[PDB]
Design an enzyme around this catalytic site. Structure first.
Site, PDB file in Angstrom:
ATOM      1  N   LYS A   1     -13.514  -4.104   8.490  1.00 26.73           N
ATOM      2  CA  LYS A   1     -13.885  -4.710   7.174  1.00 26.73           C
ATOM      3  C   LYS A   1     -12.955  -6.167   7.054  1.00 26.73           C
ATOM      4  O   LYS A   1     -13.145  -6.881   6.196  1.00 26.73           O
ATOM      5  CB  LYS A   1     -13.514  -3.777   6.089  1.00 26.73           C
ATOM      6  CG  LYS A   1     -12.389  -3.165   5.819  1.00 26.73           C
ATOM      7  CD  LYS A   1     -11.404  -4.195   4.891  1.00 26.73           C
ATOM      8  CE  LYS A   1     -10.060  -3.457   5.050  1.00 26.73           C
ATOM      9  NZ  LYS A   1      -9.408  -4.250   3.845  1.00 26.73           N
TER      10      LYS A   1
ATOM     11  N   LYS B   1       2.304  -9.534   9.462  1.00 28.78           N
ATOM     12  CA  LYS B   1       1.252 -10.130  10.373  1.00 28.78           C
ATOM     13  C   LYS B   1      -0.136  -9.556   9.680  1.00 28.78           C
ATOM     14  O   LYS B   1      -0.178  -8.312   9.337  1.00 28.78           O
ATOM     15  CB  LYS B   1       1.206  -9.524  11.665  1.00 28.78           C
ATOM     16  CG  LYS B   1       0.407 -10.185  12.624  1.00 28.78           C
ATOM     17  CD  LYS B   1       0.997 -11.660  13.149  1.00 28.78           C
ATOM     18  CE  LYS B   1       0.202 -12.880  13.165  1.00 28.78           C
ATOM     19  NZ  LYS B   1       0.914 -14.200  13.162  1.00 28.78           N
TER      20      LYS B   1
ATOM     21  N   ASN C   1      -6.507 -10.432   3.130  1.00 30.48           N
ATOM     22  CA  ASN C   1      -7.001 -11.304   4.177  1.00 30.48           C
ATOM     23  C   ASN C   1      -8.092 -12.394   3.737  1.00 30.48           C
ATOM     24  O   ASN C   1      -8.171 -13.182   4.279  1.00 30.48           O
ATOM     25  CB  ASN C   1      -7.924 -10.221   4.981  1.00 30.48           C
ATOM     26  CG  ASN C   1      -7.106  -9.242   5.860  1.00 30.48           C
ATOM     27  OD1 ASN C   1      -6.474  -8.610   5.261  1.00 30.48           O
ATOM     28  ND2 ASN C   1      -6.777  -9.713   7.215  1.00 30.48           N
TER      29      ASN C   1
ATOM     30  N   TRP D   1       0.802  -0.984  -0.024  1.00 27.24           N
ATOM     31  CA  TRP D   1       0.137  -0.063  -0.150  1.00 27.24           C
ATOM     32  C   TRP D   1       0.872   1.263  -0.043  1.00 27.24           C
ATOM     33  O   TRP D   1       0.558   2.006  -0.835  1.00 27.24           O
ATOM     34  CB  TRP D   1      -0.746  -0.038   1.369  1.00 27.24           C
ATOM     35  CG  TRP D   1      -2.109   0.934   1.068  1.00 27.24           C
ATOM     36  CD1 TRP D   1      -2.811   1.483   2.333  1.00 27.24           C
ATOM     37  CD2 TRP D   1      -2.686   1.647   0.201  1.00 27.24           C
ATOM     38  NE1 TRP D   1      -3.654   2.362   1.920  1.00 27.24           N
ATOM     39  CE2 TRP D   1      -3.691   2.561   0.456  1.00 27.24           C
ATOM     40  CE3 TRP D   1      -2.586   1.562  -1.203  1.00 27.24           C
ATOM     41  CZ2 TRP D   1      -4.516   3.241  -0.228  1.00 27.24           C
ATOM     42  CZ3 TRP D   1      -3.134   2.160  -2.100  1.00 27.24           C
ATOM     43  CH2 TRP D   1      -4.444   3.255  -1.642  1.00 27.24           C
ATOM     44  N   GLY D   2       1.941   1.312   0.775  1.00 24.01           N
ATOM     45  CA  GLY D   2       2.876   2.385   0.934  1.00 24.01           C
ATOM     46  C   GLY D   2       3.659   2.951  -0.298  1.00 24.01           C
ATOM     47  O   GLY D   2       3.493   4.073  -0.754  1.00 24.01           O
TER      48      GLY D   2
END
Lengths: 349, 348
Positions: B203, B295, B269, B13-14
């Site tokens: 979410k 994680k 996820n 994402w970064g």
């Protein structure tokens, strides 16, 4: 003291999945007569009559492949004969057949016959928007409920867990319909706001057509999730304006709303044909004949009826998603231009 | 003067964000074109990761197939990457926020502002505690959040999506919108910060549930139901445990319904949850084999939610959230997941 008799008016992909559920529950529950009739528009299949194959093979593989129908479901070719003794009528025929069927049954139903509609679409007429359940209820003179939820037929037929929403103003009727249709894997929530539940089913198909466009243009989940969101915003805004009586956002969180939107935009027929329309140059009509046994898709028809309904009030511009779906399907707007209706979309409505 | 921006984080994402911010900063005068990116240093083939990013302008280990704008500078030391920034974008894996906050405390410009892109809640502080709150309090800076249906790989490809910025101050929110908006990354700024942020955290719990169902063989009707019941538990959980005003409406922004769909359909996820359900490999092992040991937040957040509910004996109140927790940490067979849906309350 008689059990309720049930007639399923329709025998397509959804009608068949439903026959499977209703047939099994009617046989399991004392309050419902085990004999379930199903009106089947007669067809010729290799020299055999469809209704005869169904009552012999106990399957409608043409519309529901790989599944049997319970033995107590009887295919009846004449609608009057199928519906005559019924106390409960389940309307699940394509939108184009409703007019003639009602206008075949009028005056030939049981005194306190009751109705529930599973058809996703809308009608119009002076005054504007006209609910299909109200059209059936009025021509037949019977009380009406609706059943709408994320229910792709093939998964329901496989018994994969799912839910649905029943819209019904009468609690006892509502409870009876729930007992009639619920199973361990088809969960039902009964709500009283019938009109919103019904409009949700109609509108979700317009949004699904636009998600199929983006699929055909090569976009993924972030885009589809945005089509659904903006589509949900336009659906709530549209319902508040055009549905008579109280309309609450909350109802869009039932299966008929947010979930049917999701399942239809990911696995429905409207999405599939919208995508192929985006990639092939073929018209909606031709694709329907090519991919859907020549069945009329309701996503486009509904967008067309919305266009007209919004045109009379001068609101076309307020529903850019609904209107881009309309223009691509009917007025040759290039599918490649679809993203622009999402790009400047109002932030709230 | 023009605003200096520091991107604290350089993962999936970064890195996608650096593409966006690095491009906007070079094209907008109000943002200094030099954008620093704090990169937790690594050894890749006998080379420093930061020297590679600054030399080839790509971070392929985390954002495969894309270059980063040449003006984004990978800086291995966080104090140095951030000391001069006027706007700090926090987008690091949950486990690193503690260290980062202790190194930066007292070393930021006096008017520095932050925005959090991290989706999770704070581990251990019993009682729900927001990560943006944890950061704002330790560093003493005003906070905003960016949360939305943003699978990184699709954002990096410039496929149209939207996002939600949660910011209480109106001018700061517009400035953050100018910094992050792109013709293909549309931003809606709202003032209900906590609700936008809690949306991003929960979410992921629902997404683990979605993947369990995929790993059990289910399709779209079931995923739609998981999303629907998950949303219902999300709205109720937020009204129950969030401080201040929480409105259903906020859940219709990208941070709510859309992020829930995109994550349940294409999130990490979901993928890891599905692999868990199918292979029997531990959560930790799958991370190691699909997330470079990072994680996963779905389980972690579920564990926090369980901490909050079990202490109040409210575990049956959130069936779907707790089913995710019980499977991830209490050995509950994944094949028992459907039960939490079949008995779910009809309204909350």
């Amino acid at each position: 003291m008689a059990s309720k008799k049930v007639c399923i008016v329709g025998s397509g992909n959804w009608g068949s999945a439903i026959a499977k559920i209703v047939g099994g529950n009617a046989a399991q529950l004392a309050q419902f007569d085990p004999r379930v009739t199903m009106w089947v528009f007669e067809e010729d299949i290799g020299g055999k009559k469809l209704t005869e194959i169904i009552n012999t093979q106990h399957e409608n593989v043409k519309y529901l492949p790989g599944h049997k129908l319970p033995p107590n479901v009887v295919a009846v070719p004449d609608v009057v004969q199928a519906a005559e003794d019924a106390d409960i009528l389940i309307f699940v025929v394509p939108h184009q057949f409703i007019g003639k069927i009602c206008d075949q049954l009028k005056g030939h139903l049981k005194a306190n016959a009751t109705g529930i509609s599973l058809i996703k679409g809308v009608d119009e007429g002076p005054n504007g928007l006209k609910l299909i359940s109200e059209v059936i209820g009025e021509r037949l003179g019977i009380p009406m409920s609706v059943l709408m939820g994320a229910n792709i037929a093939s998964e329901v037929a496989d018994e994969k867990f799912c839910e649905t929403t029943i819209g019904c103003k009468d609690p006892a009727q509502g409870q009876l319909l729930k007992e009639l249709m619920q199973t361990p894997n088809f969960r039902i929530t009964v709500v009283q706001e019938v009109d919103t539940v019904e409009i949700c089913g109609a509108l979700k198909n317009v949004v699904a057509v636009g998600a199929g466009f983006c699929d055909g243009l090569g976009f993924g989940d972030n885009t589809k999730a945005a089509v659904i969101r903006l589509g949900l915003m336009e659906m709530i805004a549209f319902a508040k304006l055009f549905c008579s009586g109280p309309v609450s956002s909350a109802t869009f969180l039932e299966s008929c709303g947010v979930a049917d939107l999701i399942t239809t935009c990911y696995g429905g027929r409207n999405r599939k044909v919208a995508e192929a329309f985006a990639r092939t140059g073929k018209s909606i009509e031709q694709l329907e004949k090519e991919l859907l046994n020549g069945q009329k898709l309701q996503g486009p028809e509904t967008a067309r009826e919305l266009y007209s309904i919004l045109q009379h009030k001068g609101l076309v511009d307020k529903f850019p998603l609904f209107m881009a779906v309309y223009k691509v399907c009917y007025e040759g707007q290039p599918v490649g231009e679809f993203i622009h209706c999402l790009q400047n979309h109002p932030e709230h409505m």
